[PDB]
């Protein structure tokens, strides 16, 4: 599925996820968010199951973006956890956690949760 995963993906918000899957299970690339306090590309890294089950289960993967680049620093980081589902309309189905740096007093509201679905087209 390294072939399957490698490439450019778009989520329902119009964000762009550019990724390369290595044969060793690495994920590397860039992320551009259509929303939030964000501009241009941000480095991402992650991991995926490079020897998935052959029973038509999806392929588990996840990755992280820290929302700091040369343009902006949102003092936050998102991780997406999900699975790649192959076939005619390939999808990465995710849930994500966004944590922003807070004081201890604000720690209770430090983390957003959502869900993003990525496809190969817009």
Work out whether 46 is an interface residue with Na ion (CB under 5 A). yes
Work out whether 20 is an interface residue with a copy of itself (CB under 8 A). no
Work out whether 49 is an interface residue with a copy of itself (CB under 8 A). yes
User: Whose Cβ is closer to a copy of itself: residue 39's or residue 112's?
Assistant: 112
Work out whether 64 is an interface residue with Na ion (CB under 5 A). yes
Total interface residues for a copy of itself by CB under 8 A = 65
Burial of residue 57 (number of CB atoms within 10 Å: 0-12, 13-18, 19+): exposed
Q: How far, in Å, CA of 47 to CA of 2, rounded? A: 11
User: Whose Cβ is closer to a copy of itself: residue 9's or residue 63's?
Assistant: 63
Q: How far, in Å, CA of 38 to CA of 34, rounded? A: 8
Closest by CA to 99, choosing from 114, 107, 110, is 110
Hey, how many other C-beta atoms are within 10 angstroms of the C-beta on 92?
Answer: 25
Binding region for a copy of itself (CB under 8 A): 13, 24-27, 35-36, 43-53, 55-68, 73, 75-83, 85, 93-105, 107-115
Binding region for Na ion (CB under 5 A): 46, 63-64
């Amino acid at each position: 599925d390294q072939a399957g995963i490698t490439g450019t993906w778009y989520n329902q918000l119009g964000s762009t996820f550019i990724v390369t899957a290595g044969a060793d299970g690495a994920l590397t690339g860039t992320y551009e968010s259509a929303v939030g306090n964000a501009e241009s590309r941000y480095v991402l890294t992650g991991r995926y199951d490079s020897a998935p089950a052959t029973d038509g289960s999806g392929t588990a993967l996840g990755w992280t973006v820290a929302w700091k680049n040369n343009y902006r620093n949102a003092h936050s980081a998102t991780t997406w956890s999900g699975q790649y589902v192959g076939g005619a309309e390939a999808r990465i189905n995710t849930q994500w956690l966004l944590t922003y740096g807070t004081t201890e007093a604000n720690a209770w509201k430090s983390t957003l949760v959502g869900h993003d679905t990525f496809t190969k087209v817009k």
